Amino acid sequence: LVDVMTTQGGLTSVTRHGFNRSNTGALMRCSFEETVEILFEAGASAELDDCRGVSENVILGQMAPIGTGAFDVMIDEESLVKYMP
Amino acid sequence: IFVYQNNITPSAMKLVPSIPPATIETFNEAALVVNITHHELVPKHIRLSSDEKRELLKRYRLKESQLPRIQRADPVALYLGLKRGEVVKIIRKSETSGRYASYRICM
Amino acid sequence: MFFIKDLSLNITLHPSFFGPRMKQYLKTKLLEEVEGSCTGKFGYILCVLDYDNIDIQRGRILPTDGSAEFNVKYRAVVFKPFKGEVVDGTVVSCSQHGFEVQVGPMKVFVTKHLMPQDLTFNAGSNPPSYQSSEDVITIKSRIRVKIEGCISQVSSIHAIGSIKEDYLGAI
Amino acid sequence: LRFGEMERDCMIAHGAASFLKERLMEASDAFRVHICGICGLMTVIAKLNHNQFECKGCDNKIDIYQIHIPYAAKLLFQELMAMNITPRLYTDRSRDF
Amino acid sequence: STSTFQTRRRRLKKVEEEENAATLQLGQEFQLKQINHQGEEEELIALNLSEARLVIKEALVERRRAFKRSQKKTREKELESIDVLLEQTTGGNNKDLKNTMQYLTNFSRFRDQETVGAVIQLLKSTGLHPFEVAQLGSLACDTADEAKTLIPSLNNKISDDELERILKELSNLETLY
Amino acid sequence: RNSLGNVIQFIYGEDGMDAAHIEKQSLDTIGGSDAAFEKRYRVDLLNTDHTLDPSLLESGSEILGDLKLQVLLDEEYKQLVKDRKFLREVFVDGEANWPLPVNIRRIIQNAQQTFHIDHTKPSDLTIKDIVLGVKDLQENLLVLRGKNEIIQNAQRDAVTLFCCLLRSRLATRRVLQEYRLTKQAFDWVLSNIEAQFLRSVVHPGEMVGVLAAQSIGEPATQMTLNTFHFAGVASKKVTSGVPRLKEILNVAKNMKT
Amino acid sequence: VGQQYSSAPLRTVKEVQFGLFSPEEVRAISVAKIRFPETMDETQTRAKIGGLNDPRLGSIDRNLKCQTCQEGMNECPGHFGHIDLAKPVFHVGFIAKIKKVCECVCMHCGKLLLDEHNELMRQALAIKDSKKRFAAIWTLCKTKMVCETDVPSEDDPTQLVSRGGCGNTQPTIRKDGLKLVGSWKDEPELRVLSTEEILNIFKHISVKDFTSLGFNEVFSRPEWMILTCLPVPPPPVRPSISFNESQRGEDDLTFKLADILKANISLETLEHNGAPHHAIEEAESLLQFHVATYMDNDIAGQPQALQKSGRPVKSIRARLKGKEGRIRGNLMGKRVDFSARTVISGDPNLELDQVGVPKSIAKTLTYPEVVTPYNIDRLTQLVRNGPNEHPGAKYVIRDSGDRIDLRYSKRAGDIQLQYGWKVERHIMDNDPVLFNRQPSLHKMSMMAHRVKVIPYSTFRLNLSVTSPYNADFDGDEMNLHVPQSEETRAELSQLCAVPLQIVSP
Amino acid sequence: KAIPKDQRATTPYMTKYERARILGTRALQISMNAPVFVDLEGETDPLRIAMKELAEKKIPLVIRRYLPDGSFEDWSVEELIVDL
Ligand SMILES: [Mg+2]
Ligand SMILES: [Zn+2]
Ligand SMILES: [Zn+2]
Ligand SMILES: [Zn+2]
């Protein structure tokens, strides 16, 4: 928590007036106290969203990079062959 | 390094950034009276050669901006006179693990 | 004018075909959804080369169903005509409005008005034809057209051409 | 039953990536839509029979995609377009990072 | 669809699709500078009839072989020999490939992978752009005027005389029937 | 990191350990007089009164004197020492009890009655065995992995505070006179620790952000409100409780106290 | 989801490119000319006029029709129609910036007010962050109030260099209601800034000038904060509510638009008839009002734009505004299917990880299983067992994507299952579930459990798992969500399982 | 960006989140009527089967671990050490 507040430069508060203004994409901040306002000044300045933040995904109903989603899975056809007697 | 007493003329200060490369700094007396860096809480920082950095990044897959930052005007940032870009290696004491490296770029 | 462009594609596969010879089914499904396709973007996908070295890479499992998905990079021979290209082919159909010649997998039509003057149209003929002081163009004769325009359409690419210019016509 | 923020934060805490995607899509909103690969909007005219697709304006037919997002999201995005704001939805990243 | 090795970052305003012609201006997908799967640069691949015929055949043939490695556990004369190859490795509803093979097998100009070789080795010393090296390789031509008219992208790109020495040695290599 | 890429700890908790695997173990090295500390971890093979009484080690009497071992036997000491100092420079309070992965108090208690060790007969450990092993142990409590320096350096760090407990416990004088371990037992104790540790690490996925968050608000919620136990002694009034916490997170200028 | 396959390829969203609607696109996208303000009654005839809501847009009456697009009602996102405004307007939310921008540029020639020349400037033009490189450039121009013609270069302050002309004094500006007013000075000159003008200026702002200010040459030019063509959201956005037939109840939004439309017409008709010059701007404000009060209705300019009966009105914005609304109320938290809730009690006979579900629920909640040789036998068994005997099921589904209501469907008892089919079955002993008590602020407030179907209507849990939920049996209601995939139930089994939670981080 | 089998850096172990998804992912596939590379000693539950498919490390999958900067490291379930 503390580390989060600091880093940036000095003391970034845990409130609409602070952390929720950061370099974080829209929708994510969109999801806290300033909603419509936020969006407006988003499409205003041509924002672009990574869609990397939980909220970003929960809003697009996609699987968010989180534990279970902190990685992709695959089928190694080459190891799929050696697996047959 | 110039050490004024009560203050400098706003007509004066606006002459420092007029002779590059050379750089100039400004400290008040009442300021230097005590070396903050000796304070129980403040832990030692350190400048990093434009290589030890081009490394730190490489070895952390870091984009300049993703690095924790320090204020140009940060007390210790001044005490070591950093520049927009130089990185400092804050090495503190930790109750989790005795030591704990950390870094800070300079904005 | 025929081309060899390097292309890729995505194939969703069911956990079902996740056998020991999966690679097989893929290359297969590839050729099913590839050879014989059309795109004003790529033209006629005719044949896939180097069947042996088709790159499947690793495929990734989806998240709600176990279907996998690979991006199969391949290479095939193509063909997509251009408004200025001079090709010759065999005639096929013919009418009061002009004949239609076939060059490669595509059919290039030719308006009675887009061909020479001294070339009238004869109907009381059989098969139907267009006669000239010395030329005669019917079904099987071979012509050389000058594609004057292209038109992309669903799964094909027709065109309008001419034989009015010089060095064009029957051979 | 309401699966609210709190029960959300809790899953994220657990790491249950998908049991979440579920509660949110496959278990509630979920809806399919056709985006234009050009003007990232809910434009595209999908006549799901003759395959015909189109997006006159960004005048398409070719570059088209289909996606899975809760209905709310479809809604929202429209509501915003309702307020002269255009939330483009893209399927490939160009910024990298 | 079937992506084409180059992701041109389309920024909303998609309006510039220039015309196509014999101004050697072919779609984006066909500039002389296109990218190979490996990730390198490679000149466009322009095939001339007969040169294509062979290429397709080649593949169709060698496909057959590999199509059985896993099963263990004269003009009118080629029309037939081919139809079989197809009724062997093709999907059957590839009416397009068929018609192509006839055209390709009827209008071609070279049977031997050798004569076709000389053709290439010959033309690829003109520095002409692939689409010319192609048309020039699959279109009968006597006068330069005949060539330079059907293929206007030439005109200035080569003295009349030389193009004529090129057309003189094309008729000679022009395999018989 | 967070949704951007910005770091916020180059190691979760500055130690890469998962909260689940931690307890209040004591740092024997810190507390205590310079007097007892010696009477405990000090082993001098060159001295009738400061050598391991053969009734402990098997090769006890054939040691009293070896000068090649008093090189190690000492390298150890100068370390538990360098340690003592390190710690007192960190835990100034003097506080010795801290949250640390791998409970080693127990790991041994098990090693004890799992081999039915008897406090009568002598061990069988080479003094080379102990020291040279406990040294290899730390070589494997890897928390970070990198193939380069920068990282392999950060490793030694995220590990530090631990080893000190380790060495504090696996002291040549300790290992034998306190808990009669045998080559076997010992070699076991070392095995588990290398693991119990490796398991104690944190799993690259764990949404800590949210976890962290939850864990402060949970108790935050139970905090009493506007109490002031000082009231009844005005002028010695200070802001404490939720209104205070508010004050913080808010980064308020005009604080009450 | 949404039923019916589509050639279309299936992808995920990677980026979200927020921009602003250029009037040109608004029309482009639009399918409805949207001329009339009325809803339907083709003179009472039930249908819809080629006027408002469906002059092609989506539909109602359970009728495919949606510009052939058919698919009808469910499976068809409305389409946007447009509605050409007679005279440009402000964008309620953007008034803020539209102003500030002016303050940052003088009219007439419309250009920045501080080039590379003024030094304090440079230091701004470098800050990469369109968000501050702006509130900076502004802090430096709200003061300059004269479009300087010449300023001393990098040499002698004696030699003057020229840039862009016309020094026509710049006016200071103040926000009155929804219009912008500025003064010129010697005894001011107060005149209202006509939108028609502001727009112009903006239109004339340079490319590099856009950018320099927090903008974008492609997705959001400032000239687009001023509405010229109004995008009209289709039905699914402002759905009606029918009380069978002859009884229609439309949505607020549909009404505003109406008023906006009404207002619009009455305005146009005033510039093609007896135009009493300055008696018009008396209804141009009405447009602006509606066109503004439509998106937002909670402003400082008091008039709440009430709707007969004292009802406030529901501004589009009003819908997204946190808690109980679009963003925080429908997306971050949804109500969900396959959920249950009842009073709980203690069972000193269950295992820790178990949760005694009462039968009643088991028989109502269904886990869609996939017909497979491993199960066919046991599966069909349930199917037969019907949806009333416990160990049973209540729906079977074929590859053809169609439901089989096992409680009806003549062929109930019939049916021969198939490899690849699914059988929404009853929850049976040992299915992994997501038990939980509110409020949730602990990982341990939602732990997976081994189901254990039991009699009586109360969820049963083990005492020793009381505190993690922090619940008592004084009539404490708890919830329960049932997994749905095989991978899903795995995330509950291998991660959120009560025993996995015994040690708190 | 791609990382060679060498220069490998990540954990040699399997994140519970990794296993659990695999396990889940597999079972899902199994029940999707997918080939099962092990002798079902009489198992009828796709999970249970997957769990076996795993304790014999005969699961054709490769976890691609992505790194903040975009590059990834691919790890097979054959390799990944399953302690837990
Ligand atoms: Mg209570
Ligand atoms: Zn479009
Ligand atoms: Zn429709
Ligand atoms: Zn001006």
Numbering used by the authors:
A (entry chain A): 1371 to 1455
B (entry chain E): 109 to 215
C (entry chain G): 1 to 171
D (entry chain B): 1128 to 1224
E (entry chain D): 4 to 76, 118 to 221
F (entry chain A): 857 to 1113
G (entry chain A): 2 to 186, 195 to 514
H (entry chain F): 72 to 155
Publication text:
The macromolecular assembly required to initiate transcription of protein-coding genes, known as the Pre-Initiation Complex (PIC), consists of multiple protein complexes and is approximately 3.5 MDa in size. At the heart of this assembly is the Mediator complex, which helps regulate PIC activity and interacts with the RNA polymerase II (pol II) enzyme. At 1.2 MDa, Mediator represents a major component within the human PIC and based upon biochemical assays, Mediator helps assemble and stabilize the PIC. We have assembled the complete, 1.9 MDa human Mediator–pol II–TFIIF complex from purified components and have characterized its structural organization using cryo-electron microscopy and single-particle reconstruction techniques.
Importantly, separation of free VP16-Mediator images from Mediator–pol II–TFIIF significantly improved the resolution of the Mediator–pol II–TFIIF reconstruction from 48 Å to 36 Å, based upon the FSC criterion (or 26 Å using the 3σ criterion). We began by docking a crystal structure of yeast pol II into the cryo-EM density map using the program Situs. Rigid body docking of the pol II atomic model indicated a best fit within the Mediator head region, as expected based on comparison of the structure with that of Mediator alone. As an alternate means of determining the orientation of pol II within the Mediator–pol II–TFIIF assembly, we used a projection matching strategy in which 2D projections of the human pol II cryo-EM structure were aligned and cross-correlated with 2D projections of the human Mediator-pol II-TFIIF assembly. This independent analysis resulted in the same pol II orientation within the Mediator–pol II–TFIIF assembly as that calculated by docking of the yeast pol II crystal structure. The pol II orientation calculated from these alternate methods indicated the pol II cleft was exposed at one end of the assembly. Pol II surfaces required for interacting with TFIIB, TFIIE, and promoter DNA (i.e., the pol II cleft) are exposed within the Mediator–pol II–TFIIF structure; RNA exit is unhindered along the RPB4/7 subunits; upstream and downstream DNA is accessible for binding additional factors; and no major structural re-organization is necessary to accommodate the large, multi-subunit TFIIH or TFIID complexes. Within the Mediator–pol II–TFIIF assembly, the RPB4/7 stalk is oriented such that the nascent RNA could extend unobstructed from the PIC.
